[PDB]
Ligand binder design. Structure first.
Ligand code: ATP
Ligand code: ATP
Ligand code: MET
Ligand code: MET
Ligand code: K
Ligand code: K
Ligand code: K
Ligand code: K
Ligand code: MG
Ligand code: MG
Ligand code: MG
Ligand code: MG
Ligand code: MG
Ligand code: MG
Lengths: 368, 368, 368, 368
């Protein structure tokens, strides 16, 4: 039942993603000394100018200059011409820091969860490839293979699909668009060649690459001193690339900069968890689990499972499977998923869902 | 086939929405003197401090201090204690301004469109009510009826649904959460009373209000000097409340601050247009139209119509209906929808979809 | 030998003076936990926006948000309309903080010292009155006597003089100009009356007030919401009001924000010390002691005493008196004057010279 | 009657001087299109971040981005590593601009004027050399002779003097300290050599250079990426280097950023004018003319001439000479000195007094 889809992703150098990382870096820096630290911060950046804002109630001694500059360094901004230098950029800290199981969900909410068997990650091929494409570029950048490669990049992958008496089966990569920052001493012809052979063909399964597959490598020509500027960088502005690439559903809640007590993050992770567990357990080929919460109440206020006719069990058979295998209460979520651990920075880029190294990405057994 | 859903919305005073409005205000200010003005700007705010960033190629003389301060005034920030005063706030303008039908879509893209017959607006009841709830508060604020009401507010509406051999029929409002800024001389008991009788019951259809409907009015107590700080307001960070409240699909593209030449805005409007037209023409009760574009190409690169079994015509009968009634090329979109007109500021709050006063909200005939 | 002179001073609310205080407040906050803390910081402010910049090598835990906001509170900025509220203003900290007798003067330098017997403070009458005028207003403000009085103020005092076979004898106050911020509920007539009776006549010696003395109280009319804005506030920009009101000599070195290791502060204090000691010891009625240093060298590189023919001893009689009573080496200065003590904030306003509560203002014995 | 003196100066790259220039650049940009433009602005900078503040009532169309960036370019900040790049730095404009002979002096004031015959410029040798030292470095920088030389520099000159039955005769240059920013590819040994032979010895008269003269060239080692940060540059913070290097007297008034209607600038210029005219006319070898003004009154409120016994005429013979040759009223000053002309930027660096190219530096005839 043919249709096509497109998804995107951005590198660690993207203005918005730098803020997402810095914000989560500050979250990590607190969890390491106080796992109960209340973090609520965000970052704004604009050409060698980083503004750290936020309200964080914690009891740990942190050098914000150090955590911000170290994060910028990690990203690859050490030289001037790159559009950012951790040693010279302005780090204005306007941060306010205080000191002092059946909890109860804060703020009325509605979190979504999604999973599909089109890839081993249980994530849309389009977004998976989009992320992996950026990931590979960072590898070649940090390894030395492609020393002209710079931190800021953007990726878009559009794949042609076809339904199947249930749902979504990828057929081939229709077109790929990739833009990456770079050094001056490297020709546009050499860049486009390396992007096709060393990055695209080194991550995209042969089955999907075609003789007609369209490539748009460095479409706008050069992107040298571009760097993280883009008029300004902000936290929580890359909401769709952090999730399913426009495939599931999204209420609008941002992750980065918020601790484990905010249902926007925790519950979203939990919903992904059960979604991935369901398909992994063969109970369905594609699911959209919807978990609702009521302010004050701990136990979820109605969870809905949305298979697209890919399950044999039948919604409200699968719900009991979830109700017998999962305890989606806020407090239990953080305990079961180990959400007091400082893994948030690595979650701030290349997507929150998909990578198996995260607790919520490890499928639960599911006793049926 | 019961399930519940929740959606939210924010008032004109919300930090993020202030930036969305200011950014669009600058867009309007340019279109009035140069309908071909290229606008690409964004705003950042934090307690009496507004930063205007952006690259705009236009040929019009604009007083940015005036357009920013006037917008803050319109919102209702004229006094000190409110958290913003257009006469005293810092307006730092870092804006860069230059001077000099079958066009061709910029940037590979994938826009979504959605519409449902559960309301006359052809929008989800949950988000419609959420918007109207905030709208009413602004009315009572500007009329004088509720003079304690201040600009910043947040609304959440969760409605219980039930499918119907096709899709989505609202049953009742399960719970409503509303928070609004306010003056000091007004008791929490009087506020909660006015919110229930004068705002909620004055906008929510009797059919949906219940004896069990849960109300959470000013849950966190007092919201006095809670003016636009919310730890830095930003443009394009309220992506879901500007669209369908998490009901359709969203690629992640922001509207505010971008002119009519960016497919992220125009094409999204166009997709909503055809979606609304389809249901209005009786061709379906709920649609998710998906329009894809290819960088360089003008004519859309595959449009998909997604009814949920609510149409009798059958997808790929409805597609020809769309292909015979619509010309979704970028240039034609702006011409047909009159996208060179300065209506963007009023679009920057209370949702981009739903209100009939916008071109894309006027259903096309559809000759079948 | 008649001539006239004018001097000025500003209140604790003056934008520049707020920065001078905040900068010294941060210096005090470090000395209390590490008397060897290396402080080099400055502040910038602009309508509810404070920027703390600087490089300080210390080993003490300081809450910059607390030291900045507490300083703004002390000044009297607690309400909105005053142009500053310590609870709501933006405190952007871009501060960089590290951790780890015959020393030797840093930076080639030339410090000046001045003293005259026209007042018990051994300071020019014009500047003394200018300072005391602002001091009194702060008292009436903090006591409650004049509750309409606000933090920001400016004072100018012009006195008619006459030489005397040696130098400078004040005759009468020619004119007085005073401007002070204020609350709305207070008439311009009542303000000008209180300024003349309760502040001017309560500080200016009867001998100097005349029937012709000109008064300019609140010349520019109102100064309500003025507050610390004045387009921006800066540290080290009120160099002359911090010293002798334009009577001695000034190389241009700023005090506030610099620790005791900078000869600009320490040596300037030392030079004032010897100047005051000389006149107090009857060795002269007016002196301008000039102390020069050489980078690397500890012992002063030539000290010059400049009496205006008011001494009977004779320059190079008085120099030996200084060389036998004083050891102006940097390290000795800080030890003798107790410059590791946190008294710098109170030094940041109303003048560095004149007030006896400071070590350098206590005359040394002088054995001749 | 031996004594020594020291003075300093800074290059066009010094943070404070950049702001002084930018502020005056904005003043020039207005005078060219509206000679009656009311300008009152100031600048703040910090590592690729320039903030333009101010209130200017004018009727001219100015591109502040252009005037700020052009000024930074002129200074020599075009590359990244230099600590500033006019093409990439953040120019935040928070400027507010409106549109619409016997005048009368604004604000009670007291301006000083000074002149000495120790040099042809009628300025202290110490400050003259200090300025010329920086000037020469800019020449070698812009010519190409010393291509490693960068914009930011600081100079200090200490000369040994001796009185002479009247006053001040320079004997020799005791020591010279000069620090200048530089490129990486240049040894500290080569820099110090070029500073002594090509800059110092090319500007300092043979008569003053000695075999004992002490040189401190690049004392602190390397000054590479030391571009304009210096922990925030500011306008009006280099008050003494803009005048007499600590030789005359200074009330504290800043020049840069203020138009010709502010007595702080105009009257100060006028006072220098008469001082220079007096010595040039042989009426004295050293003068300190003091001109006082009264708010509202046009005609100066008492002018005092202070010779140090170097005049044969006798104070109150010279006063009539001034009263018969000069009309120091504000309005007349601007007319006679042509103060509506855009020459203020070149006045913003290397000193306001001394250079003959300025109106106030052209001695008036003086008919006696
Ligand atoms: N000077 C400008 N002219 C036109 N568009 C601009 C300009 N500056 C920024 N933009 C923006 O870029 C968006 C569309 O194109 P594009 O996606 O190529 O930008 P980017 O710089 O690549 O952004 P990102 O990393 O999110 O893609 C628009 O929404 C528009 O606001
Ligand atoms: N809008 C403006 N028009 C004219 N002058 C201004 C304006 N804004 C600020 N000023 C400044 O004030 C100076 C002269 O007058 P005045 O001393 O009354 O200012 P203030 O606001 O009182 O300053 P301070 O506290 O140092 O006196 C000038 O140098 C000028 O730069
Ligand atoms: C040649 S423009 C490329 C810039 C890139 N879109 C960015 O993220 O800023
Ligand atoms: C009526 S204007 C007075 C303001 C005052 N000069 C200040 O310091 O800002
Ligand atoms: K945007
Ligand atoms: K968002
Ligand atoms: K100034
Ligand atoms: K100064
Ligand atoms: Mg980008
Ligand atoms: Mg591009
Ligand atoms: Mg994007
Ligand atoms: Mg002031
Ligand atoms: Mg005034
Ligand atoms: Mg002043």
């Amino acid at each position: 039942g043919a249709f096509m889809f497109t998804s995107e992703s951005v590198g660690e150098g993207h203005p918005d993603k730098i803020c997402d990382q810095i914000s989560d870096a500050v979250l990590d820096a607190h969890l390491k000394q106080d796992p109960n630290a209340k973090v609520a911060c965000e970052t704004v950046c604009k050409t060698g100018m980083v503004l750290l804002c936020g309200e964080i109630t914690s009891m740990a001694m942190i050098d914000y200059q150090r955590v911000v500059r170290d994060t910028i360094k990690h990203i690859g901004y050490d030289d001037s011409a790159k559009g950012f230098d951790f040693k010279t950029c302005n780090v204005l800290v306007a941060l306010e820091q205080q000191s002092p199981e059946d909890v109860g969900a804060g703020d009325q909410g509605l979190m979504f969860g999604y999973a599909t068997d089109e890839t081993e990650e249980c994530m849309p091929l389009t977004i998976v490839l989009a992320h992996k494409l950026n990931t590979r570029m960072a590898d070649l950048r940090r390894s030395g293979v492609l020393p002209w490669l710079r931190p800021d990049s953007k990726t878009q992958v559009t794949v042609q699909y076809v339904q199947d008496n249930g749902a979504v089966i990828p057929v081939r990569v229709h077109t790929i668009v990739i833009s990456v920052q770079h050094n001056e001493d490297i020709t546009l012809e050499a860049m486009r060649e390396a992007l096709k052979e060393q990055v695209i063909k080194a991550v995209v399964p042969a089955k999907y690459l075609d003789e007609d597959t369209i490539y748009h490598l460095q479409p706008s020509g050069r992107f040298v001193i571009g760097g993280p500027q883009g008029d300004a960088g902000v936290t929580g502005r890359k909401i769709i690339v952090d999730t399913y690439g426009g495939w599931g559903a999204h209420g609008g809640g941002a992750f980065s900069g918020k601790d484990y007590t905010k249902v926007d993050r925790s519950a979203a992770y939990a919903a992904r968890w059960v979604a991935k567990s369901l398909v992994k357990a063969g109970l369905c080929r594609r699911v959209l689990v919807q978990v609702s919460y009521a302010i004050g109440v701990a136990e979820p206020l109605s969870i809905s499972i949305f298979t697209y006719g890919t399950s044999k069990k039948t919604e409200r058979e699968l719900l009991e499977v979830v109700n017998k295998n999962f305890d989606l209460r806020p407090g239990v979520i953080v305990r079961d998923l180990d959400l007091k651990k400082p893994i948030y920075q690595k979650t701030a880029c290349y997507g929150h869902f998909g990578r198996s190294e995260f607790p919520w990405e490890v499928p639960k057994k599911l006793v049926f």
